[PDB]
Amino acid sequence: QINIKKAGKVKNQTPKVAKQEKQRAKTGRCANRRKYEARLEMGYFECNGKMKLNLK
Amino acid sequence: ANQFSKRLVHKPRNPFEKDRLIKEMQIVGKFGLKNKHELRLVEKNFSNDKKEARLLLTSNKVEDISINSRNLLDKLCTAGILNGIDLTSKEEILNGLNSILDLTIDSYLERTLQYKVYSSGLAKSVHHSRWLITKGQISIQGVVIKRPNYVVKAEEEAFIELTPYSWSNNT
Amino acid sequence: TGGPRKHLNRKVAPTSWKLDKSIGTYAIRPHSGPHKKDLCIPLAYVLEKFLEYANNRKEIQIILKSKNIKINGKIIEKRKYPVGFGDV
Amino acid sequence: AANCELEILLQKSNSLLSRKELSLKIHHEESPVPQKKVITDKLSKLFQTKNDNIVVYDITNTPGTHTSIGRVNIYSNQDDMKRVEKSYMVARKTRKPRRTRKDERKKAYKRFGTVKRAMKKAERK
Amino acid sequence: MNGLFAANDLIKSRKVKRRSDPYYRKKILGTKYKHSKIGNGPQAKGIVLEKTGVEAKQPNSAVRKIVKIQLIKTGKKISAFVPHDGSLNYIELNDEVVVEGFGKKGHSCGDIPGISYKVVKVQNVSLLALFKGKKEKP
RNA sequence: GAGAGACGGCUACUAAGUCUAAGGAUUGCAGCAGGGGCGAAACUUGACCUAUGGAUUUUAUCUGAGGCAGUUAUGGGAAGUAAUAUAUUGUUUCAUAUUGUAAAAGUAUAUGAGGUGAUUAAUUGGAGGGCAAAUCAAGUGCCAGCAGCCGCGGUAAUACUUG
RNA sequence: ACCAGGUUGAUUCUGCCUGACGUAGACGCUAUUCCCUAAGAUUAACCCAUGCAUGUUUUUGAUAUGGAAAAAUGGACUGCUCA
Ligand SMILES: [Mg+2]
Ligand SMILES: [Mg+2]
Ligand SMILES: [Mg+2]
Ligand SMILES: [Mg+2]
Ligand SMILES: [Mg+2]
Ligand SMILES: [Mg+2]
Ligand SMILES: [Mg+2]
Ligand SMILES: [Mg+2]
Ligand SMILES: [Mg+2]
Ligand SMILES: [Mg+2]
Ligand SMILES: [Mg+2]
Ligand SMILES: [Mg+2]
Ligand SMILES: [Mg+2]
Ligand SMILES: [Mg+2]
Ligand SMILES: [Mg+2]
């Protein structure tokens, strides 16, 4: 008297929205370059990391 | 593994510290390095002579002050991290190993051919040097080098020029 | 191993022969002679490495069969002849 | 664009093999490494022996330096050059496959006689 | 037993006390060759027989989906846990599976009782990729 | 036979066989390739005496010892996927000479064209604490599921599913 | 030459579990170069189709201008595996 009929109920039920294409992300030392100049303008080194990076 | 296939450097002990990633990222953006891995290679040999500098201060052998310690001071002086000292005098040999403990990682990281171009007037930025070396436009006195992490010795410092027959010049 | 050995290895070669421990695998096991195992060297290494008269195996036979080589006042044409200490 | 210069380093004389040895130095300033046809012509002016008696080999370019190294062997006449050199080093200046030589040798050690006997037993049948 | 010439009495005494180490005791008796469930290897193969579910312990409440298989190397029967949502719909009977362990030194972790193995491959198709939707099941 | 209790030498028994005109005859891949079984688990039924060696003088005889190439995320190195301010210049994916090779590759030196970094040119794992990073949005409501340990899920979930 | 989370309404200890880090094998997803280095050991020292790995030498000279046999010399080294 154990039910197995409800296998996979939630994932097939939620509707699918499509992906949105993005620009080609830079890779290499230029990827480390875009991350370093972006941190230096907001003073991330001076306040010793006490801020929120992912802001949305 | 075998001698040709062992690894040189491991991961750090603590993977996530906010007090370590901030200090190291100041070094990557300043000197222009692409990987966190290639930073780890230049610091281990910085650790290895400091492992040897402590032993020569505590040696009780009468000849170890003459031979291996004088064979320590030269190898840095040829690459030119140390400036120069008189090896005949005994008391300055004691000063040479005492000056060794006051170095940093930047004393090794500054004598690289990528940074040594930009500190001269040839390059505008340090990222101007990495894009210039790999195309083959920069030459030492006879040789055309394509490795930006090539260590530059002391005597070969002033003889860095452009390649005379490249398109970076007129020809 | 029911008998004698006839193949020698380059890693256990004597260092006084000044050989390279590079690409080769085997080395020449010289003949029995008057000298001991330590004070002897093969002849084919002398005409190649120390003296410089030949380049490959073919030019070794040319000088040896032309009968100019004179060890202790005797002509010899075998490349495995051991040159010992003190001989002229 | 073709450039070649010759500099002679370590000239030595060999009496038993009847030859001379030297190490060459090539300056190719704005050019590739030279072909061996033109360099054999250049030694015929300095060394007055015929161009056929001269052999050169092992032209290696040092990387990114525009300068290559090679070796020179010269003889007087033509016949001793065919005698003292190797075969393929001569044939570059101017056999049977392996898998067939193994088959005929194994059939040869089978027989106890000539081909006269090998047919003679087939005559009886 | 502290003395200068007492090395024979020191080694004999310290070997006795070392036998009460619970990790070292299993190394002497060799229980990993005697009482191993799966053998001595990272994975195994099997043939599915049932598709049944179990109920987890208190205070949580759910139904955990498992499968009873039979191994090839030894021939025993064992149960394994299907590790992702909606993945049992691929599985049919009279089929082959590959089994991987949990990583807690031979014990059961989570609130799943008495089960120490989980399925990784079905018909040489990766179940982690098939949940993502990269491949299709034949 | 100088040296074998030898197995690419011989004799017998035991376990497995194969050919036949039925009287008899015959085989040992823990040698190199290759197939079968076993398993979670491991490559070309390829060319050659160039270099190092052995066979009683080894410059032309033999050498699956030993070199030279093909298949594979077994690991370690030198490097790429941009730089200066839309634009300028110019690294790889293309070809060709010479050097080289036992004969063929490949590397190095030089030379050709075409014009693109949303491109031929970046992925894997994670976002409550340990432990760097969202109380962002939409669905489901102790179900479906996640979690090495502590622990979330009862119609406002930063702890499941998608974006 | 370095420690963190977990027993209680809250505190201090003993004690264990877990996280962080190495070395050999297998596996999932994704891959542009070049040089170096490796590949049926773990279970089965289990069975093998086919092709190939040990012959040289005027010492004499086959009714035979250069090869039949006989003599001589080495096949006991080298290579493979770990019962
Ligand atoms: Mg673990
Ligand atoms: Mg044997
Ligand atoms: Mg034996
Ligand atoms: Mg026997
Ligand atoms: Mg055999
Ligand atoms: Mg085999
Ligand atoms: Mg493998
Ligand atoms: Mg992602
Ligand atoms: Mg935090
Ligand atoms: Mg986990
Ligand atoms: Mg989490
Ligand atoms: Mg085996
Ligand atoms: Mg005979
Ligand atoms: Mg074993
Ligand atoms: Mg055993």
Task: Summarize the helices and strands and which ones pair or pack.
This is part of a larger assembly, with chains A (56 residues), B (171 residues), C (88 residues), D (125 residues) and E (138 residues).
Chain B: H1 18-31, H2 37-57, H3 70-79, H4 90-100, H5 106-109, H6 113-118, H7 127-133, E1 138-140, E2 160-162
Antiparallel strand pairs in B: 1-2
Helix pairs in contact in B: 2-4
Chain C: E1 8-9, E2 26-27, E3 41-42, H1 46-50, H2 57-65, E4 70-71, E5 74-75, E6 82-83
Antiparallel strand pairs in C: 1-2, 3-6, 4-5
Chain E: H1 7-17, H2 22-29, H3 31-34, E1 44-55, E2 63-71, E3 77-81, E4 96-101, E5 117-122, E6 125-126, H4 127-132
Antiparallel strand pairs in E: 1-2, 1-4, 2-3, 4-5, 5-6
The structure holds magnesium ion (15 copies).
Chain D binds 2 RNA strands through strand 3 and helix 4.
PDB class: ribosome
Keywords: Microsporidia, Ribosome, Intracellular Parasite
Entry title: Evolutionary compaction and adaptation visualized by the structure of the dormant microsporidian ribosome
Features:
part of a larger assembly; 5 chains; A: 56 residues; 1 helix; D: 125 residues; alpha+beta; four-stranded antiparallel beta sheet; 27% strand; binds magnesium ion; RNA-binding; ribosome
Describe this structure in words.
This is part of a larger assembly, with chains A (56 residues), B (171 residues), C (88 residues), D (125 residues) and E (138 residues). Chain A has one helix at 29-40. By secondary structure, chain A is mainly alpha-helical. Chain A is elongated, with a radius of gyration of 22 Å. The N and C termini of chain C lie far apart (39 Å). Chain C has two helices and six strands. In chain C, a hairpin with a 2-residue loop joins strand 4 (70-71) and strand 5. Chain C is 16% helix and 14% strand. By secondary structure, chain E is α+β, with helices and mostly antiparallel strands. Chain E is built from four helices and six strands; from the N terminus they run H-H-H-E-E-E-E-E-E-H. A six-stranded antiparallel sheet of chain E has the order 3-2-1-4-5-6. The N and C termini of chain E lie far apart (72 Å). Chain D binds two RNA strands through residues 1, 28, 30-36, 58-66, 68, 70, 83-84, 86-88, 97-99, 101-102, 105-106, 109, 111-114, 116-117. The PDB classes it as ribosome. Keywords: Microsporidia, Ribosome, Intracellular Parasite. Evolutionary compaction and adaptation visualized by the structure of the dormant microsporidian ribosome.
Structure described in brief:
Chain A is mainly α. Chain A is built from 1 helix and no strands. With 138 residues, chain E is α+β, with helices and mostly antiparallel strands.
> Compounds present?
magnesium ion
Shape of chain D: elongated
Count interface residues per chain for the largest interface. A-B, 12 and 12 residues
Which structural class fits the helix and strand makeup of chain D?
alpha+beta
Q: Label the overall shape of chain E.
A: elongated
Percent strand of chain E equals 25-35%
Helix-strand pattern of chain D: EEHEEHHHH
> Which structural category fits the helices and strands of chain E?
alpha+beta
Q: Return Rg of chain D in Å.
A: 25 Å
Spatial order of strands in the largest sheet of chain E? 3-2-1-4-5-6
Largest sheet of chain E: 6 strands, antiparallel
Kindly state the number of beta strands of chain E: 6
